[PDB]
Amino acid sequence: LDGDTAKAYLRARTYAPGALTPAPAYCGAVDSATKMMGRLADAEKLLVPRGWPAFAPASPGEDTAGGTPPPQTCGIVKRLLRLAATEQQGPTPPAIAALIRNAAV
Amino acid sequence: MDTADIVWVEESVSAITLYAVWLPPRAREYFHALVYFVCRNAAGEGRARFAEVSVTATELRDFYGSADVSVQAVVAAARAATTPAASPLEPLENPTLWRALYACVLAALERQTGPVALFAPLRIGSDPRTGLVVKVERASWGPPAAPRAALLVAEANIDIDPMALAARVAEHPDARLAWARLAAIRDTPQCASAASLTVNITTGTALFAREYQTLAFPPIKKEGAFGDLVEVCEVGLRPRGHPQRVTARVLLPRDYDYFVSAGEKFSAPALVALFRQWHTTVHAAPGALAPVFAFLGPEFEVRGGPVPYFAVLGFPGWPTFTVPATAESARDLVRGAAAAYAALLGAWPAVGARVVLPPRAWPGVASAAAGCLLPAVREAVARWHPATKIIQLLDPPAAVGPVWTARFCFPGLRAQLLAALADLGGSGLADPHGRTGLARLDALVVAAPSEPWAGAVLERLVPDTCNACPALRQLLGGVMAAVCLQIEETASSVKFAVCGGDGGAFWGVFNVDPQDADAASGVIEDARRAIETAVGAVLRANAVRLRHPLCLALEGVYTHAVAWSQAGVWFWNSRDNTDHLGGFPLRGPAYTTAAGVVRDTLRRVLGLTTACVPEEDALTARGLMEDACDRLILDAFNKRLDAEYWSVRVSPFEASDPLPPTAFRGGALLDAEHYWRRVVRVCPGGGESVGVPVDLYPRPLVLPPVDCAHHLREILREIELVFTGVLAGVWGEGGKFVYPFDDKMSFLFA
């Protein structure tokens, strides 16, 4: 890669320049697995009205078995990684700001 | 009928509208209709005039196009539409019934009273004792009053449960969301009374602003008076089909003739609600008759329509033109809309192809026209099939190297042929009063060369006419085949060889030294003249009288041509670098960059071929093509986050991703979907690759990464088609062109 493509790739595929930099305190979304799932559901509810696809998860003991019975931990981890790796277009804060609840992230 | 009591006045008619439709005292075979004209004098002064016409069941069946219609159903629908408080969307039940009704009423009025035209001087003779217009003549009393427009901006907030919209969509899998919104509003009319509205009407004399928190309550913000826009007039009439005297209350506009609303965001429900409130307010005091309340548009059909319009058949009484905004050519758009309204009497596009001839009268005209012509032409017409090849042409993949290529064209040949053949079949017309539609078509054809709006009207009207009568397709195809045969026969002697085309547009090669453009430009003109003369002679010998004289047009002159399919072809002029590309799909903003890349790469390859080299040349061309694809993919990375650039257009006749349940919450954004649906593709997980309707959500959008790999593969398939065709044609290579994407470039998006 060469030109502006190299800069765009480097910026879009690594942590933000100010992420791994010492700060007085932390700004993040830290919580247990179950509370993390609840916060993820709340953030997804906030985001859906603007295009973000819904989750539609399955669960044993429900009224519809269907398929894809994965553990909650794996699903939450994948959703967290996808949210954290989603970049921002223009001045609009990224999607993770709906979970972290800070506009400067 | 007695002419001793008719009072004659010189005036102009601005619009013709439908007021009432009733069954006479005892009559099960026909009905009566009361038409309302808003006429204007030489200095500008609104007057309201009324005419009464009688329509039989035979005419209604002829215009409907079938035999499953009855006068009782028409009368019931008309009576139901008279009360918009409960049934404000009656034409949504059966739109074809209302189209047939309007066409029948217009034809009967045009035949009984006389020649009626909009925005043209006329002499109207009315009966003082009856109060009804009885005769219309065409006169010339100087310059008629100029039409006056009035800008409109209406914005409404109607709330409909997304559950109802989802259920309606589930009922019809391919339905449009505008129709779903209209049907939901129809189911519960009370939702229109509780909506919040804002209306701004700006004319040349006053202004009218209103802001309703709820349409059933007095406005919160008001500016101007309703008595300034429209005047309420009460008239007394004695129709022959009414036992006693009747009264009519009408809205006469002041200082304008029609409303003009830009295309930024037009919502039919907002205008319908505003007009429904006006109808409820005006027609509240007892004493008069309530006019019908009917509207038409592309959103009144389940599958929508490709042309957006808004037709008013009753209340209030004047047309409304929707014109797309943000064009620097808005003025010409409005002028063309007004010209189309005046020329076609306001029926098109509402009625459809019935503005020319009733759909049940085409078979006779087509058969009579086929009966004419010459024996060989009739045999060709009878045997015509859409899959037959008439004249031998080049077989793709093919390539014509240094030669004098030339693209030719007969601008508007199908429309001209239809106009000429309808006249030939006019002897088969049941009655001589159907001639008016053919005269309208002739006027459109005559004005098409100098008026682009006429060209667009004809381009949209001819396919509809062919659809109406499947027997017209064969009649037109046979004549086109004869034309192509004559073209080939004549070109075989002017140093020409036809390599492609269908008869209306073709291209070919010339047998001339390919170095002297001065001597080569004098052969192309001679060939064009000879071909035009021969085609004209062949058409004349068949009695086909072309009202507008023929004109063959040279669309270009090139030196290299490459054909990779029956529809795709690339022409290049190696001296001016001009070129033409045809047959490349363009279904989104990302298919234009691909087209530009393809054209640049082809230019480079065909310019390299001039230097000349053996198969090494083919290898170099392959390398250049791969480089071009690499650069295109690399440049497509900087637009990885843009969703409207990767969104692709889908027609109502293809398979699309299911609508996400959150798309029904858009509200007023679902009122703008009538033909096209733009869908992007996003990847929210491992391999989900879900689809998102881009235009059904408020902006800005918050979406996962776009699926640029899938879109890029779809575009690369088309790119490789063209490149493989070029390689096979210019260098005789069986080896297809394939680009490794999953191996070398798929990492940028994963």
UniProtKB/Swiss-Prot annotation, chain A:
Effect of residue 91 to T: In strain: Nonneuroinvasive mutant HF10
Compartments, record wording: Host nucleus
Function recorded in the entry: Essential component of the helicase/primase complex. Unwinds the DNA at the replication forks and generates single-stranded DNA for both leading and lagging strand synthesis. The primase initiates primer synthesis and thereby produces large amount of short RNA primers on the lagging strand that the polymerase elongates using dNTPs.
Subunit: Associates with the helicase and the primase-associated factor to form the helicase-primase factor.
Family under the similarity heading: Belongs to the herpesviridae DNA primase family.
Protein known as: DNA primase
Lineage: Viruses, Duplodnaviria, Heunggongvirae, Peploviricota, Herviviricetes
From Swiss-Prot, chain B:
Keywords: DNA replication, Host nucleus
Record's subcellular location: Host nucleus
Any matching Pfam family: Herpes_HEPA
Record flagged with keyword Transport: no
Gene Ontology BP, a term: DNA replication
Effect of residue 353 to V: In strain: Nonneuroinvasive mutant HF10
Outcome when changing residue 612 to G: In strain: Nonneuroinvasive mutant HF10
Family affiliation: Belongs to the herpesviridae HEPA family.
Subunit structure, interactors included: Associates with the primase and the helicase to form the helicase-primase complex. Interacts with the origin-binding protein. Interacts with the polymerase catalytic subunit.
Annotated HAMAP family: HSV_HEPA
Protein name: DNA helicase/primase complex-associated protein
